[PDB]
Symmetry: D2
Subunit: 358 residues, 4 copies
Amino acid sequence: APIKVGINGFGRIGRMVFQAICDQGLIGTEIDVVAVVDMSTNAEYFAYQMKHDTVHGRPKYTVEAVKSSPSVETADVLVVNGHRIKCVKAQRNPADLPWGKLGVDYVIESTGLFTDKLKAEGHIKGGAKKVVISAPASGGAKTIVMGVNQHEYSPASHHVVSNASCTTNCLAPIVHVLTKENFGIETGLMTTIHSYTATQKTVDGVSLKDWRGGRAAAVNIIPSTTGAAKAVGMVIPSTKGKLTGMSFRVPTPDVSVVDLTFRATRDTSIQEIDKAIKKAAQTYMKGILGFTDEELVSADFINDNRSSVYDSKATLQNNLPGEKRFFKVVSWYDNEWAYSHRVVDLVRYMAAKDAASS
Amino acid sequence: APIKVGINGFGRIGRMVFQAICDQGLIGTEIDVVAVVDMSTNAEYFAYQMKHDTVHGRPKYTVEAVKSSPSVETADVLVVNGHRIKCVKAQRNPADLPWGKLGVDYVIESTGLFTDKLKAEGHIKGGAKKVVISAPASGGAKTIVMGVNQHEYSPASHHVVSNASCTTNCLAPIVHVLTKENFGIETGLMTTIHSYTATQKTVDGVSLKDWRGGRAAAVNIIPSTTGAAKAVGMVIPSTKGKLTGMSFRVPTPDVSVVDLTFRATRDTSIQEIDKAIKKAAQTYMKGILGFTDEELVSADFINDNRSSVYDSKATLQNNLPGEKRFFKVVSWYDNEWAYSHRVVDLVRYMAAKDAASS
Amino acid sequence: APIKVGINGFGRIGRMVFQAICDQGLIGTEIDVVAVVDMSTNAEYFAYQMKHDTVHGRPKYTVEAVKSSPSVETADVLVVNGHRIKCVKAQRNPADLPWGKLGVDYVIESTGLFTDKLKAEGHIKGGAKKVVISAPASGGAKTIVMGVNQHEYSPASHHVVSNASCTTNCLAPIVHVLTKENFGIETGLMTTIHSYTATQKTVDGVSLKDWRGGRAAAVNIIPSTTGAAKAVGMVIPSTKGKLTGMSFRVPTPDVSVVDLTFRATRDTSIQEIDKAIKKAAQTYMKGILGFTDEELVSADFINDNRSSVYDSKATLQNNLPGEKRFFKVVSWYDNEWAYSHRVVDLVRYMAAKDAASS
Amino acid sequence: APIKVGINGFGRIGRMVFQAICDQGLIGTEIDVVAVVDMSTNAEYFAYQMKHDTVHGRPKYTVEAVKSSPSVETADVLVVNGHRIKCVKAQRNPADLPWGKLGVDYVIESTGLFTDKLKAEGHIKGGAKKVVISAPASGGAKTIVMGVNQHEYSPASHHVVSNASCTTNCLAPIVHVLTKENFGIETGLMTTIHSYTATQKTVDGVSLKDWRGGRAAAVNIIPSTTGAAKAVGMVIPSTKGKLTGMSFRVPTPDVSVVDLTFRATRDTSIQEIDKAIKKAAQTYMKGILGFTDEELVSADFINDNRSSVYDSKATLQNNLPGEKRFFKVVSWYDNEWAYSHRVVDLVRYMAAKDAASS
Ligand SMILES: NC(=O)c1ccc[n+]([C@@H]2O[C@H](COP(=O)([O-])OP(=O)(O)OC[C@H]3O[C@@H](n4cnc5c(N)ncnc54)[C@H](O)[C@@H]3O)[C@@H](O)[C@H]2O)c1
Ligand SMILES: NC(=O)c1ccc[n+]([C@@H]2O[C@H](COP(=O)([O-])OP(=O)(O)OC[C@H]3O[C@@H](n4cnc5c(N)ncnc54)[C@H](O)[C@@H]3O)[C@@H](O)[C@H]2O)c1
Ligand SMILES: NC(=O)c1ccc[n+]([C@@H]2O[C@H](COP(=O)([O-])OP(=O)(O)OC[C@H]3O[C@@H](n4cnc5c(N)ncnc54)[C@H](O)[C@@H]3O)[C@@H](O)[C@H]2O)c1
Ligand SMILES: NC(=O)c1ccc[n+]([C@@H]2O[C@H](COP(=O)([O-])OP(=O)(O)OC[C@H]3O[C@@H](n4cnc5c(N)ncnc54)[C@H](O)[C@@H]3O)[C@@H](O)[C@H]2O)c1
């Protein structure tokens, strides 16, 4: 049973979803990537985009750009590891995409334009059974963070699911062991020192909706907002209105770090917390939550696919010496990598439960 | 008589041309900026963008944002030292712009989207008399570099003119005094090590016309094409087919350097060349061509309004010892600031020549 | 009566303390900078460093390099605006410095090698009557943040004064009015997102005492320690053991931002806190604390000489909506420029007190 | 029969040479690394430097740090792949290093300090049989570029050998096929847009020998000099007084590119030169000279061990269309990694020739 997926928007996350599908062994055997969609249908230019990444390197798979038939002027079929993917043209409305016809059942929505559960339904109107939004979703969609609440999915009810944001996926696992191990956050504020993204600008330009976010990106520390402010309360309803935060966008191109400051419900210590987070990383959060005892800096997490990886030393040293309630917890994440692995983990969970019931 | 100008595209070059008008003492008196055009009309946002620049800092003029009538919702008039500039909404076609209505005669075309003579003429159809494309132009518009061939301008024939590009305004001064002082160039190639611009990308992205241009801009040395390649031959026909070159877009926000390598027409020396450039700096090319004897790096050329500023020490330490024909000439330039100043000098030179005749 | 000073270690803080002295209009008239001490005595090189700064531009003063005698090989005296500062060679011990000879009474200890009280007394034995260390000090030196506790300085008891770090001169204003306006801080942790310094490395290199800190500076978010972790308790005895923090060094050359997360003593609001700080900013903290109501990023604080300028918007927008105990204060600072001005303002304060008593 | 080698200065080149020895299969069987030398004897700090590199990522090999006796305070032995390397304490004179005692015959000198052939013999007085200087040398040390002139090595008389610089290793292959294939280079001039290195400064600071080299590294285009200005004439004497160049140090942490403008000795075409370089890349320069047909940028050459990998499209698109003599040739290089592999290549060659005769 090849899960038939199509990628709408072959950008940073689209191309890293694609690469997490090939690197993890699933192309053409477990998941069938039927088609990819973006502005051009020049498969040679997509191959160029895949083969050479500034931040994550050359990939291990191989890519060819072949035509479907010599009647077409430019290569339109991509051939990865002998698997053929089709380069479909970008549609302004989700519904004008031929999903049903190409036989695509699960569509990964990663353009960034269709974050509303209502516009994303246009995929299903085009023929898709399910939709995963690689972002926070507005308008009613289900937001799941793997390792914390993927089980609340239901094939029957949830058809446009959302995998939250990179920072949610990092914060929430931290929050989830704090509650489940019962330290509890009474209240919590959080900062994500975060790499710049494709929504920012090389030099000072136009950004109407966030004035600061239009400042030259690679030469300014830019205050702005994070997506995990809302979404962690959505995933864990016990933190609704207990926790919020901001974002500082600094001049690195990938990897970010969460910096959570909370107050505990019961009296505890940072040694108890560090123990429970390591334990959790080895037992029930394994693969999603990780930890590190080394003096790592940010470029040591490029290509690290844990959702969140707790920094044991930066935490243990930077807390109040005899504290029972006021705690800092530092944790890292490759905002482009681990998040692209979680999208594929979610597709496959959903396909499993969709077959499990119908 | 105030020159009635309208800036279409209030971006890096739009806002720097504006500020140059204020810093030189022309607003309201010598130059009247009737209107500016961009993706919004919210003048409180153009205020912010004028008041805070990452590279060139805070401006000396004062900016206020007020509403034109109490009927409007967001402040839509700019007021720069008690002079009113209007914030007109952007139009997809130049012909649709109310230029004759607003009373604008000269339009500075700096959107980047209308570098063709004919899409630029839509301005004259919208009620403008003359257009200055802040870029090189296709379709056949007049290309004039100030200090070299601005005298070639005719009020009768040149309605869409072009002030070439930043690199062309840096290299043609140098090429000009080499041809005029009789050293001559037999053939020559050129390289601009240049700052990234707003067409480049924060993280690797789409740029289907120059594939390399699409790669993360601030973490890479990106080879690409320079404007001064086509344009130095248009300005000096003597260099047609004898001079071409490339760009290496490097991770700095502003200022670029030209690295000219040429073979001279007669047997000379680099000290003869160094003295002639210094001479031409102090005599005929003043304010256009400049020079330095100091050990400077790119940050020192921020806000240097010279088109070309020769580096006497880098040229001299990095040429062959007793050479008569093969030489290197190095020359800096603030690609944002000096080019903007030269646009204002062109507007003013055209507007005076037009009055002197009609 | 010119306050006889000499600067030991003319680097970033040494040249910004020097430009602060000249710019405020003090050189020659109120402060006589007798000598500057560094690894060289080539006043031509020192003058290359003064005239061109990558982050703070061309200074307002003029620097000339003169020979004291034609008997010396290279220029060894700096003539800044007609005034003569001598270039004395750098000694490995403060003690062997000719202070008593040169006439120097106040020494600004900005090498960063003699931060302990006792190696700092090495200047006094050698002739200086007073010493200001541009850094937190060990061995029991008096730590003073201007505008918070300079009233505690006594000419009799305190000869080796510490002006604390740049982050404590940013954090200590805000903790001072938070206690003075009785909100009070129960406990609190802080993070500074901070620009890389002279003590960091261009590529991965050696740093034996903090491992992460030797990593490539300009391409990593390097977690580390801050100086305000100790210093704010030395200055504000109330905060002894209630507040600590950490630093994240990010890829910008200058300007940083504190981000304090505290739990207040009483029940309050962020609009209450917002008013209390702004008020304080206009009244008793005017010149030390500042605020902004604008959407500014880090490069808008280059050359802002307030110790701490509070960002009203980023705070109000990024706090929990109806909270009474748990808050986040965000505040900027130009760690090179603001600090240096406090140095010149401590010399000036201490000096007159000494002249008041003896 | 292992070659016994010691590395003095375990910095960027020392650690990359170490990693090229383990990568190429050579550690413990073909080359035995008896000792590494740097500021510390802390095996743990060395292991942290080896395992986490910002640019070249995690090494494939495994590093442990053990104590050589129960008596030593801190781990002083590395155990890379079961092979034990000693951590010898850094010395001020090469001669005070225990090479004969340890049993070291070949010494990779890579501190950046002992670049004089006389200072370098200190190693042979310390007990070593040969010295390789990872940098151009003075005082008459024989200079070799692998792939161009290592056949000029005489076991007999060449004792302290210099492997030239990274730019001579890129430049000399190109210059070598142009003279061997009989295009010739009459006079030539080059420029290398180049990543910053460890001799540079994060923020503006001290640099007495090159004034510009002290300016903040990651925020300027810094003109400077190159090592291949001297060394290529020494490897290829045909080109002494005929070829020279300069350097621009830009904000990338690794990879650099050679922009070479030369005039041929005979009428030829850029198409012809392009074929010759590809041909050479495939036959006698293989593994040393490569080429690319792709639209690559600097980051695509990280971990590319060819010494000089020619850009076919950048060279072909940026030359004069009718030219027969005056050309531009562009070739890339990972200045840390390819040079490191070549140092191992020379040590290996040298050692086999020395065995062959004695
Ligand atoms: N960048 C990150 O680190 C990151 C992390 C987590 C989640 N995400 C989320 O994923 C989404 C996409 O982010 P990204 O960083 O990949 O951006 P991106 O711009 O690099 O990629 C988006 C791609 O969508 C394409 N596209 C736009 N409109 C399209 C359309 N109508 N039809 C087809 N293709 C279209 C664009 O050309 C682009 O290639 C965003 O919602 C973002 O929040 C990004
Ligand atoms: N920045 C430089 O280094 C530089 C130097 C020399 C010449 N130029 C030339 O100037 C032109 C603009 O360059 P820039 O660097 O200012 O870019 P920019 O993107 O900062 O500015 C262009 C502005 O035009 C606006 N715009 C887009 N469409 C518009 C429309 N239809 N109507 C009105 N406004 C519109 C954009 O929002 C933007 O603010 C380019 O063609 C470039 O070649 C730029
Ligand atoms: N840069 C900042 O943001 C900042 C802010 C606040 C305080 N400081 C502090 O000020 C001190 C200097 O820091 P910096 O950033 O200016 O560093 P820097 O390295 O630029 O300045 C140090 C200067 O001292 C010189 N020097 C070294 N040894 C000397 C000696 N023995 N005698 C005389 N001069 C000597 C160096 O050549 C250099 O010019 C440090 O203690 C630092 O903590 C720096
Ligand atoms: N990195 C490049 O791009 C490159 C390319 C070609 C050649 N090289 C040459 O390599 C040499 C070293 O440069 P690098 O880039 O490795 O710099 P680096 O500063 O990273 O390495 C030098 C190492 O030597 C150590 N060291 C200093 N003094 C020592 C001493 N007295 N004894 C023993 N070890 C000592 C330092 O701790 C440092 O780790 C230079 O001569 C350079 O020109 C570098």
